[PDB]
Paper text:
Human Na+–taurocholate co-transporting polypeptide (NTCP) is the main bile salt uptake system in liver. Here we present cryo-electron microscopy structures of human NTCP in complexes with nanobodies, revealing key conformations of its transport cycle. NTCP undergoes a conformational transition opening a wide transmembrane pore that serves as the transport pathway for bile salts, and exposes key determinant residues for HBV/HDV binding to the outside of the cell. NTCPEM adopts an SLC10 fold with two structurally distinct domains—core and panel —and contains nine transmembrane α-helices (TM1–9) with an unstructured N terminus on the extracellular side.
During cryo-EM sample optimization, we screened NTCPEM complexes with these nanobodies and megabody scaffolds that result in an additional 85 kDa of folded domains in both detergent solutions, as well as reconstituted in nanodiscs. This yielded final cryo-EM maps of NTCPEM–Nb87 in nanodiscs, and NTCPEM–megabody (Mb)91 in detergent at overall resolutions of 3.7 and 3.3 Å, respectively, enabling structure determination. In complex with Mb91, NTCPEM shows a marked conformational change compared with the inward-facing state. Core and panel domains rotate around 20º and move approximately 5 Å towards opposite sides of the membrane as nearly rigid bodies. As a consequence, the two domains separate from each other on both extracellular and cytoplasmic sides, and open a wide pore through the transporter, exposing Na+-binding sites and X motif residues simultaneously to opposite sides of the membrane. The pore has a minimum diameter of approximately 5 Å, and contains a large volume (2,400 Å3), with its long axis oriented at an angle of about 45º to the membrane plane. Consistently, in the cryo-EM map of NTCPEM–Mb91, we observed extra density that partially occupies the pore on the cytoplasmic side, wedged in the crevice between TM6 and TM9 and in close proximity to conserved residues in the X motifs. Our cryo-EM sample included both Na+ and substrate taurocholate, and the density probably corresponds to a substrate molecule bound to NTCPEM. Despite the limited resolution of the cryo-EM map (approximately 4.3 Å), we were able to confidently model NTCPEM in a conformation nearly identical to that observed in detergent solutions (r.m.s.d. ≈ 1.4 Å), demonstrating that NTCPEM adopts an open-pore state in a lipid bilayer, which therefore represents a functional state of the transport cycle. By contrast, relative movements of core and panel domains and tilting of TM5 towards the membrane in the open-pore state unpack the extracellular part of this helix away from the core domain (by as much as 4 Å), creating a crevice between TM5 on one side, and TM8b and the X motif on the other.
Numbering used by the authors:
A (entry chain A): 12 to 309
B (entry chain B): 2 to 12, 788 to 895
Amino acid sequence: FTLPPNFGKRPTDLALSVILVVMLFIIMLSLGCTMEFSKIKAHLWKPKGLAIALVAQYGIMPLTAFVLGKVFRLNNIEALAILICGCSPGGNLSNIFSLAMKGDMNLSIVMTTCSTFLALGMMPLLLYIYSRGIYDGDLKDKVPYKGIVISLVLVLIPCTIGIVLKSKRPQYMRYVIKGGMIIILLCSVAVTVLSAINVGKSIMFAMTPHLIATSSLMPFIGFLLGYVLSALFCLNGRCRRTVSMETGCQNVQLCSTILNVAFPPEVIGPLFFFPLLYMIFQLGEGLLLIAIFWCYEK
Amino acid sequence: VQLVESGGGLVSLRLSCAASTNLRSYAMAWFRQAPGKEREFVSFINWNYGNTRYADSVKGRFTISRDNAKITVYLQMNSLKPEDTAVYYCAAATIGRLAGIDSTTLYDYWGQGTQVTVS
């Protein structure tokens, strides 16, 4: 039927976000201890790295989202929910997937933070070419501009402070990461349980044959089509797995902020759960990709 | 090429709204135009899902329901009041936009129209 619970509730809906920031802060700060700045400028100065990946999600992924719209003949609400997901920048949770993939972790940031600063300038003007007949009003104001900067900077701080630890005393990296492995696993329990308390109950309605089909094949095409254009275009073979996991993976916590404001919530219904469900299959597709390229070593 | 209604006779009557063309609408609602008055909101239903939002007076009385198989939309009425005599105008919403449910600006397609009368 409906989505009974109301969102933005202090008891549980805030615990999904006020704890996720704590979850992301330490994780990426811990992730920040595997990058050397002295070769970061090498990635930036010669743009052969990000160019294939940045184009792979600002000139290719919107096509994948838009093609699935017209081909599947989805209504102009879900045909726009998956298009907004397509234009979304490189996911802050994608940088995790480069670590397990043995990819070039230094090039992950150069296409995560640099491809999010383009979301400010592309997406507002990337919708006029893709919402010409899917939405009547303008999307200029609906985009959460102040919700990206407070998201990029919250990501940028562990990006730099994560390596700065190697400047004063890295002896205290032992004193930090030895507990980070111990401690951050407690947060994931709080993150996963509370989600099943508030939004997980009404998930059963959200599934739809023409909605799971897009949410299942779109993270997959983003993965594969991001890789072939990466490795085959003369880029390093071992570095290609960094681009592949960045093209397919992209944030969807930014799409939900648009649907809340773009148009009324009774039209949405439990379509609020698509970005939550999209990441589940986005995560699920990768966790099948992790093993396969961990098989090639063995 | 507009939507097609049935029913609406002198008086519990249920009236259908079938789309006259194969079109994909994310939400369909019913509106009512009182004699010599502005059209007022009556009922709403989501299309993919079952979200519904009836108007103030009609909160308990009427009931709007779709069918999975066909594309018709129904509005079952019960306990009709003699102030409900008006001309009901089925409405459909094709393209998404920011507009109030109660407001008529959200709906891109309208209906042929049918008149309901009671005593």
